[PDB]
């Protein structure tokens, strides 16, 4: 067949969000609140193109907007966030429910210094709409032309010409 095209290693260099999973899980509700638009443009491009090579730049925007999400935490509320993700980080299942007062301190300092409202129960699971400028893929599966169907039956049904025509049976 053909050669599969791959992007170069410079096309894959972006500054990584090099924080732990409890750090990501601690700020995840405010992350889904504040980093909505580039994340949803990326996941729309990712379910529509069905190809990650066509989804690099939007992904870079994700990694552009996540870092600016954490810098904006690090400039303002580094200590209550640190006290919060440490308590998230203790738990083996990483329970939100074991960590409600540290969550309250982090949410208080974030609403005071950044004005961010934490999403409620049922908001980040909504199907939202995304206004992009990229065109709709007319053939995301790269499917070739389908075979033409067999001709259907038409014409009025006539009797059998002289019956069964089986050796001597005249009907």
């Amino acid at each position: 067949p053909g050669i599969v095209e791959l992007p170069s290693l410079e096309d894959l260099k972006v500054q990584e969000v090099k924080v732990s999973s409890s750090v990501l899980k601690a700020a995840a509700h405010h992350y889904g609140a504040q980093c909505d638009k580039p994340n949803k443009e990326f996941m729309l491009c990712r379910w529509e193109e069905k190809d990650p090579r066509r989804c690099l730049e939007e992904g870079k925007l994700v990694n552009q907007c996540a870092l600016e999400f954490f810098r904006q935490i690090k400039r303002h509320c580094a200590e209550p966030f640190t006290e919060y993700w440490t308590c998230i980080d203790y738990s083996g299942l990483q329970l939100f429910r074991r960590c409600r007062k540290e969550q309250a301190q982090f949410d208080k300092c974030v609403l005071d210094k950044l004005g961010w409202v934490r999403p409620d129960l049922g908001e980040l699971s909504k199907v939202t709409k995304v206004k992009t400028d990229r065109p709709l893929p007319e053939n995301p599966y790269h499917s070739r032309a389908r075979p033409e169907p067999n001709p259907e039956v038409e014409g009025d049904l006539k009797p059998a010409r002289h019956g069964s025509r089986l050796f001597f049976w005249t009907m």
């Binding site: 609140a33 996941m43 409202v117 129960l121 049922g122 980040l124 909504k126 709409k129």
Partner: protein, 80 residues
């Protein structure tokens, strides 16, 4: 209807408790008002990603953000 029932409750109380609990388990979800909320909670549980829609221009019932007031809500679950 009460002579046979008292007779089987005096002879076989294990089977009377068995048929009674089985009958309650059969008929009671058709009478409970909370059976609707079981269905509602099991469809409100987001196991998958809420895959976004391309904004065609006319989808007023679809939000543009999770914190927008339109869309499905879970206030019925936060209150109960």
């Amino acid at each position: 209807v009460a002579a046979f029932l008292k007779n089987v409750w005096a002879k076989e109380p294990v089977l009377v408790a068995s048929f009674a609990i089985a009958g309650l388990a059969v008929i009671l979800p058709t009478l409970s008002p909370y059976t609707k909320y079981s269905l509602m909670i099991n469809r409100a549980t987001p196991y998958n990603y809420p895959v976004p829609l391309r904004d065609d221009g006319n989808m007023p019932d679809v939000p543009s953000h999770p914190q927008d007031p339109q869309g499905p809500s879970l206030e019925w679950l936060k209150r109960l």
